[PDB]
């Protein structure tokens, strides 16, 4: 007998006919040619093609759309197709069933191929051996080629080069504008950066009161109105009902305090109405006020957004420490390494930047300079090795109150993969949580 399972089969098909989230978590592992029988292969094909566009694949969308191709009473028809929905209520572990399906399928295929090798070995039919063995090689290599995850693999130089020439081609005729990717408005900062490159991990990190969550809100807040393409925000630090007040205040140039009290004048209300209505004809931004996460959860939500429409253009994670993968919570360094690698994967996957805030250890207080460097953060440099940019913050007027630098936040770029190190000066005015340019003397 050839090994092949039937319980896993019915269960997988019924569960996907019951919970239309799982198409990712299954299709990552499984291929339509893994089922021993043909009807369920037709069914799986339909599932994938609909979930490409039409998410609901349970019974009635499936039955009714499949009707048009004239394929009822041919895969067991209506009542059998419903017998899938009869049993298996919980969809206990779609994952493991879907693992063993692939397992036995690959075993069966390879054993078949070995048998055909032997029979053609004792039945040459006017064949060479040197001109033969190419068929053995190609027959065996056909396995994973039947699996290829949407045409991924080692590209050739010409395709890569044409991608690059296409970049320069689209870029040249349009005004150069300095940018080489995504913008921020700060025309002093785009020079040391050339834009948040479209596929890069960015990190922002300074001690608590130095106001960096502000800076990330500023970036998304600008990049929205400069684009017409989405963004994300994960606020593991405070809920949306503060975020939007802050961002609204930042745009309309009025403090948080007067809003939450209500002593503000029509001069202000005009700016409020402007920024409000100008957000509410774009629907760019998307916010999440969750608390406990795993990177897998993050990837799920993000891919959901990108599948619903188009493609995102930005991310802003907030206060990265709370991101757990609890398997390793006995330890810290391995944990942080895991988040770093997972975010880098996501970033390169969707061709997106990432803006992952952090924190620093207070040891620097015992140094008398307090301008941070690549060492003060102590996570075995897990994120340090993984970044494609880092830029710290240092607002002087916290520590040295009598200092001749009031509302002057500098930005110490401590690592940059493509450009060089640098330094920037900027101005902080926490009455409405916003940075501005510095058209003042040198740095």
């Amino acid at each position: 007998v050839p090994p092949h399972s039937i319980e896993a089969e019915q269960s997988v098909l019924g569960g996907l006919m019951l919970d239309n989230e799982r198409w990712d978590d299954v299709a990552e592992r499984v291929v339509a040619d893994d089922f021993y029988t043909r009807p369920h292969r037709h069914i799986f094909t339909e599932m994938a093609r609909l979930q490409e566009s039409g998410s609901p694949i349970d019974l009635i969308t499936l039955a009714e759309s499949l009707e048009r191709q004239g394929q009822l009473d041919s895969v067991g028809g209506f009542a059998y197709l419903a017998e899938l929905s009869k049993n298996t209520p919980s969809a206990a572990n779609i994952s493991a069933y879907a693992d063993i399906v692939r397992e036995r399928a690959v075993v069966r295929e390879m054993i078949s191929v070995a048998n055909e090798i032997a029979e053609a070995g004792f039945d040459p039919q006017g064949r060479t051996s040197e001109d033969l063995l190419d068929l053995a090689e190609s027959r065996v290599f056909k396995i994973a080629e039947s699996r290829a995850n949407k045409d991924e693999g080692p590209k050739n130089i010409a395709d890569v080069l044409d991608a690059t020439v296409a970049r320069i081609e689209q870029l040249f005729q349009q005004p150069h504008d300095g940018v080489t990717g995504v913008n921020t408005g700060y025309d002093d900062l785009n020079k040391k950066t050339a834009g948040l490159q479209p596929s890069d991990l960015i990190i922002v990190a300074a001690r608590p009161s130095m106001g960096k969550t502000t800076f990330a809100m500023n970036l998304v807040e600008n990049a929205a109105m400069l684009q017409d393409k989405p963004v994300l925000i994960f606020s593991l630090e405070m809920p949306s009902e503060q975020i939007m007040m802050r961002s609204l205040a930042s745009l309309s140039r009025v403090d948080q305090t007067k809003i939450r009290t209500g002593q503000l004048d029509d001069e202000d209300w005009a700016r409020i109405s402007g920024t409000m209505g100008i957000l509410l004809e774009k629907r760019n931004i998307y916010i999440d006020d969750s608390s406990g996460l795993t990177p897998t959860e993050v990837r799920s939500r993000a891919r959901r957004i990108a599948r619903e429409h188009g493609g995102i253009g930005l991310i802003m994670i907030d206060y990265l420490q709370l991101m757990r993968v609890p398997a390793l919570s006995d330890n810290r360094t391995l944990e942080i390494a895991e988040i770093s690698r997972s975010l880098k994967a996501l970033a390169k996957e969707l061709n997106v930047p990432v803006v992952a805030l952090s924190q620093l250890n207070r040891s620097l207080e015992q140094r008398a300079d307090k301008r941070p460097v690549n060492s003060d953060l102590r996570e075995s440099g897990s994120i340090e090795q993984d970044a494609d940019l880092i830029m710290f913050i240092y607002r002087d007027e916290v520590y040295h109150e009598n200092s001749d630098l009031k509302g002057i936040a500098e930005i110490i770029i401590g690592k940059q993969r493509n450009g060089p190190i640098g330094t920037v000066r900027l101005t902080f005015n926490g009455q409405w949580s916003r940075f501005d340019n510095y058209a003042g003397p040198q740095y």
Partner: protein, 49 residues
Amino acid sequence: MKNVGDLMQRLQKMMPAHIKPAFKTGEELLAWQKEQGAIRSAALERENR
């Protein structure tokens, strides 16, 4: 629960009318922000010195 036009009209009860933003869009707003920031930088420098 309540949508955009109704949301805006809802907030409009808090204000008098004839208050219009006269901004109408985004890039103009960013220009205005650039101007105000560079205004402020000067007085900031004064106080520093």
